Design a binder for these strands. Sequence first.
RNA 1: GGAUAGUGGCCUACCAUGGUUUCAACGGGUAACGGGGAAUAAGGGUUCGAUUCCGGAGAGGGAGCCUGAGAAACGGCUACCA
RNA 2: ACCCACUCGGCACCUUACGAGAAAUCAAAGUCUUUGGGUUCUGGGGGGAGUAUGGUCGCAAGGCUGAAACUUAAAGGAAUUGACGGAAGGGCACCACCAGGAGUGGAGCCUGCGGCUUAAUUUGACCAACACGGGGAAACUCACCAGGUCCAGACACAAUAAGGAUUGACAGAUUGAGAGCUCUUUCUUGAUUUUGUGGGUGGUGGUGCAUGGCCGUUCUUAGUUGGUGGAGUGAUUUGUCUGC
RNA 3: CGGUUUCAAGCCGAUGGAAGUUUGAGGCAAUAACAGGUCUGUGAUGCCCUUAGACGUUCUGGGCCGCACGCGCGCUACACUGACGGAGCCAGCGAGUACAACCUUGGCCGAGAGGUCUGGGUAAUCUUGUGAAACUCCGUCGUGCUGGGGAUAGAGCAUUGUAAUUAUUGCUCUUCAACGAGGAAUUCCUAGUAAGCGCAAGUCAUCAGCUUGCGUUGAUUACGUCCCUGCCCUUUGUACACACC
RNA 4: GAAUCUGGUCAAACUUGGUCAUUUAGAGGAACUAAAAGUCGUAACAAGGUUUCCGUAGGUGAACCUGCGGAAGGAUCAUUA
RNA 5: CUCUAACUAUAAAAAUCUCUCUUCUC
RNA 6: AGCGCCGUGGCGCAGUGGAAGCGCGCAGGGCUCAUAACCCUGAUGUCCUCGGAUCGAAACCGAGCGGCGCUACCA
Lengths: 102, 143, 25
Amino acid sequence: PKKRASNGRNKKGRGHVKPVRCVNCSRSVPKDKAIKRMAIRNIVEAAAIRDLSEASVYAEYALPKTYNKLHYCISCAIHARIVRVRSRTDRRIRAPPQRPRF
Amino acid sequence: INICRDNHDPFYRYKMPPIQAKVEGIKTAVLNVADISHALNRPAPYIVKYFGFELGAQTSISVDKDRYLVNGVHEPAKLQDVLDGFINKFVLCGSCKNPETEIIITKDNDLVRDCKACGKRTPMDLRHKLSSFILKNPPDSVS
Amino acid sequence: MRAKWRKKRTRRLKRKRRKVRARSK
RNA sequence: GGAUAGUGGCCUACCAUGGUUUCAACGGGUAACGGGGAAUAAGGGUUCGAUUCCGGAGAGGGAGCCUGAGAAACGGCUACCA
RNA sequence: ACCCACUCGGCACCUUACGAGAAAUCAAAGUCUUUGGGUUCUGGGGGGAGUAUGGUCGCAAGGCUGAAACUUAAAGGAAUUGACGGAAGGGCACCACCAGGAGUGGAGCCUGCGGCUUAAUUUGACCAACACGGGGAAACUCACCAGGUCCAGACACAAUAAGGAUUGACAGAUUGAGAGCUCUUUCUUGAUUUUGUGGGUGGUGGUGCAUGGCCGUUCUUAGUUGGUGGAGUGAUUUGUCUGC
RNA sequence: CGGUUUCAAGCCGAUGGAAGUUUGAGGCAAUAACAGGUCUGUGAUGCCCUUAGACGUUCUGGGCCGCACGCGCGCUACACUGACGGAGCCAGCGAGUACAACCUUGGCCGAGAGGUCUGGGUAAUCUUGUGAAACUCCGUCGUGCUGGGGAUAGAGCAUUGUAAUUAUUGCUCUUCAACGAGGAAUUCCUAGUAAGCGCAAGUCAUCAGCUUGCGUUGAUUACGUCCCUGCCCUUUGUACACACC
RNA sequence: GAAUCUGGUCAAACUUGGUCAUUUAGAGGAACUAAAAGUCGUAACAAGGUUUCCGUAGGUGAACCUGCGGAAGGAUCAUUA
RNA sequence: CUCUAACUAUAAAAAUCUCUCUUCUC
RNA sequence: AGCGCCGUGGCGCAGUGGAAGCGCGCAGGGCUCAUAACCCUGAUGUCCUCGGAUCGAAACCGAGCGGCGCUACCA
Ligand SMILES: [Mg+2]
Ligand SMILES: [Mg+2]
Ligand SMILES: [Mg+2]
Ligand SMILES: [Mg+2]
Ligand SMILES: [Mg+2]
Ligand SMILES: [Mg+2]
Ligand SMILES: [Mg+2]
Ligand SMILES: [Mg+2]
Ligand SMILES: [Mg+2]
Ligand SMILES: [Mg+2]
Ligand SMILES: [Mg+2]
Ligand SMILES: [Mg+2]
Ligand SMILES: [Mg+2]
Ligand SMILES: [Mg+2]
Ligand SMILES: [Mg+2]
Ligand SMILES: [Mg+2]
Ligand SMILES: [Mg+2]
Ligand SMILES: [Mg+2]
Ligand SMILES: [Mg+2]
Ligand SMILES: [Mg+2]
Ligand SMILES: [Mg+2]
Ligand SMILES: [Mg+2]
Ligand SMILES: [Mg+2]
Ligand SMILES: [Mg+2]
Ligand SMILES: [Mg+2]
Ligand SMILES: [Mg+2]
Ligand SMILES: [Mg+2]
Ligand SMILES: [Mg+2]
Ligand SMILES: [Mg+2]
Ligand SMILES: [Mg+2]
Ligand SMILES: [Mg+2]
Ligand SMILES: [Mg+2]
Ligand SMILES: [Mg+2]
Ligand SMILES: [Mg+2]
Ligand SMILES: [Mg+2]
Ligand SMILES: [Mg+2]
Ligand SMILES: [Mg+2]
Ligand SMILES: [Mg+2]
Ligand SMILES: [Mg+2]
Ligand SMILES: [Mg+2]
Ligand SMILES: [Mg+2]
Ligand SMILES: [Mg+2]
Ligand SMILES: [Mg+2]
Ligand SMILES: [Mg+2]
Ligand SMILES: [Mg+2]
Ligand SMILES: [Mg+2]
Ligand SMILES: [Mg+2]
Ligand SMILES: [Mg+2]
Ligand SMILES: [Mg+2]
Ligand SMILES: [Mg+2]
Ligand SMILES: [Mg+2]
Ligand SMILES: [Mg+2]
Ligand SMILES: [Mg+2]
Ligand SMILES: [Zn+2]
Ligand SMILES: [Zn+2]
């Protein structure tokens, strides 16, 4: 039948898109069927944020943050549990899962 | 000892010895592949891999150490007949049916039967898997 | 099955019959 | 012009370059004689029509024929092929 | 450049069914049996097969075109609830592990199986069979066997027959036998029987793959449902469920 | 009562009490199924078969108990926490004779198993307080396949039983093997539990390593997790629906 | 006014070869059906244990894999966390 | 009828199967 | 006629100075409802015949046997 209205692609009127590559499986993947994330994080692990702070010159520091736009294939992403299989009546909800922490 | 063919009963002609099989666990080691190989001017891998091609089962080939294992339950008649298909398709030439023909590549990659008595370049059945096998390993130079 | 390989097999058989023609003509 | 009961490239002679076509020509096939009709049946329709009626066509295959108003006749002929 | 209000055109999106669909769904897949805005091209079961063949284009790889014989009753679409999933998640079990404990498999013996053997090693079980059928049986029990008996063959009909339907038996042989089973010989007994048939009991005889009944397991887990009532044409589903 | 919970269901710790894991264990225990087993339990039986030299029944005897082998329940040992001579002396389940031979006490002979005379008991009286083992104490053995181990091979003595050979069972002596903790793998288990140890009762004429219960000595290590093996619920895809065999 | 016979004339027909249709054997060559207890592996249906499938090209006992491009018929309709 | 923030990381091998398919009525 | 090689448990190689070696064989067991894969445990032997060396020689050497690879038909 039809798995999805958008055919799990989200192209819908673009003819073609230049492919990107997965971070993990490293496959050529259409940029829209290319589930991807902002793995925003501070430069240091949350555990040692104390020690480093008093282990350094230049008090009242900023503690920079490292960023990356990670492109995940379908297979790797579904494998690493970062995307969850869902019921069809549950699949369609495109809203992000409501701000993991608050 | 065979007269190098099956449906051919002369008293004078070039000779081939029969091949046999011993058991391993299961896979049969064939004792007499190098001698027939030298009697047909064709390397042993062609014999073994042709037998496999008409057979359709996993096989093991090791020319440096004489352990030619072909997997399956094959009575003497079956493998001697597959090798008969080998010699008729490969070893013997057209006109005189010479049991010594070499396999030669011209400037084109036309793998061809070449003889000595009639000496023709018999149009080879490149439409067989053993043709690709032979072209993969040039004779007496990549073995 | 894999109709990929069936189509390729048909193409190869046609190629072989064409080359048999080429030798025979 | 000839020829024909009489038109007409019917045939000839001199010329002229034309005629037909995707609106299906020409070629191929037709276990097709065409029709009146038959079967079938809400209506629309599908198939069959060698065969009682109509026409047309044949007398083994082609040709040629006198006679006769009317014949290219075949229970009339001239010839070849079978 | 922004916000408001309206709109034109474009990709789309959310709800809904008002329709329509084989449904999955679709704002067109609607305005389609209440059958008819105009429109070009396609397919008529699956294979055989995009195959053969003849073209055609091509340097070639190959494309466009394109069968039939034959062969089969299904192939197939959506959709259902189960089963499955080295798929995901939520909880479980000492018939799972972990921590360890104690052992089994090593030794001998006993018992139970299989296979070999013999007449037979009677047989049924192959997680839920195997110290089980109380299967720890010297007879039996017994279902195995070499033998020996006996009828515990009703009832009915026919059948004989009181000058005998018939049974029983000391002794010898014969049989282990002290069995009158069999004989040799005689005596006893009397109408219950005896011999045929119709019909009949017994059968640890066969068939648990004909069955009951019984208990085993599935399965000690948490699972199972119907009456309205709703959601689907239905098969069904919900009630049985988001969480804790 | 104190924690912990949208403050709800409840959960955790402590106090108190015998009992604070559903107090402990059990037994009753759903729908639907299986081609599970059993006709060998029946006087439950269908159907088929045999029914007189019988597959019925009975009598004898042989057989169910044999062995080039393998696997699977168990028992005793592989020794020093031991074994052995003696002493010390704690239990609970039970059971036990009628139309007949049970429970055995006590006293007598035997070294023993046994045998005799009596005695009570149809059962809280009698066996009984089953004087059970394991266990403890005091001696001996001294790390040696040796007093561990005792299979097995000889001879005899007893008892039950119509009948013990193919050793019934018990006893006496001699023989004393293999056994040095056991490959791959696998089973069981969380508290009076595991383990050892015995007792009883079913089977029983007579025989237990069997089993059902009972009690004795009395635990290391948790108080968890889905890694293996499964299970339950939910989601999900299936071309599976004889269901991953 | 017959025979014979000049011409042409319609022209059947015969030979000769070309050319075609249909049957037609045919050394040998290459396939497909049905037969489901042949053999080797297990390609696929689940994430089929390397996602499938398609076009293309090479190789590969066989399945198929491989490189490049695709599509969801996928196992993702989903990051203004 | 007034809120816009945190966050991690496995992928070892598993190949296969010839069974019977059975019936619903007041 | 002489020199270089060898002497298996069923087969291929090896260490030959502590005395029967592994893979592959095979009998059996383990695993799985089942088969394989795997896991493991076991059985065959006179490193050729006889001596020297050595505590001990299959083994270092030798006084030869059987078989091989060259010289090459060597009056
Ligand atoms: Mg799908
Ligand atoms: Mg997506
Ligand atoms: Mg025509
Ligand atoms: Mg017609
Ligand atoms: Mg007509
Ligand atoms: Mg007419
Ligand atoms: Mg007239
Ligand atoms: Mg005519
Ligand atoms: Mg006429
Ligand atoms: Mg006429
Ligand atoms: Mg006439
Ligand atoms: Mg556009
Ligand atoms: Mg079709
Ligand atoms: Mg098709
Ligand atoms: Mg073409
Ligand atoms: Mg638990
Ligand atoms: Mg169970
Ligand atoms: Mg287990
Ligand atoms: Mg463990
Ligand atoms: Mg024990
Ligand atoms: Mg053992
Ligand atoms: Mg054992
Ligand atoms: Mg037996
Ligand atoms: Mg048992
Ligand atoms: Mg018993
Ligand atoms: Mg007995
Ligand atoms: Mg008896
Ligand atoms: Mg007996
Ligand atoms: Mg009987
Ligand atoms: Mg009976
Ligand atoms: Mg019966
Ligand atoms: Mg049954
Ligand atoms: Mg239950
Ligand atoms: Mg309802
Ligand atoms: Mg419900
Ligand atoms: Mg409270
Ligand atoms: Mg309870
Ligand atoms: Mg059964
Ligand atoms: Mg008898
Ligand atoms: Mg027995
Ligand atoms: Mg002792
Ligand atoms: Mg007491
Ligand atoms: Mg001793
Ligand atoms: Mg002992
Ligand atoms: Mg003990
Ligand atoms: Mg489907
Ligand atoms: Mg199906
Ligand atoms: Mg003329
Ligand atoms: Mg195979
Ligand atoms: Mg596979
Ligand atoms: Mg893999
Ligand atoms: Mg794939
Ligand atoms: Mg498979
Ligand atoms: Zn990836
Ligand atoms: Zn030749």
